[PDB]
Amino acid sequence: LSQAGAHSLTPLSMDVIRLGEKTVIMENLRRVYKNTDTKDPLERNVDLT
């Protein structure tokens, strides 16, 4: 699978955070659901009883 594909690489900018030598990319998805129709699946309706 890793032998299959992923040949070249390109640099691009984003933002990361460092937590216990683990760097993880922070991301938000407002630009993919800005003026769209479907609801953002991170916005959720939880329900207690």
Partner: protein
């Protein structure tokens, strides 16, 4: 006594309120009725 000679002056573009504005001089507002801008947008 003497005259109230201590008067001073203020300008528009010296004020920072022009940062909220886009000042445009155009000598025919009296011949102008409305000013419209119409926007077209497709949705993703």
């Amino acid at each position: 006594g003497t005259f109230c000679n201590r008067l001073e002056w203020v300008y528009f573009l010296t004020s920072g309120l022009a940062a909220a504005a886009h000042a445009i001089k155009f000598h025919d507002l009296n011949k102008l009725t409305t000013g419209k801008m119409l926007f077209h947008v497709q949705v993703p």
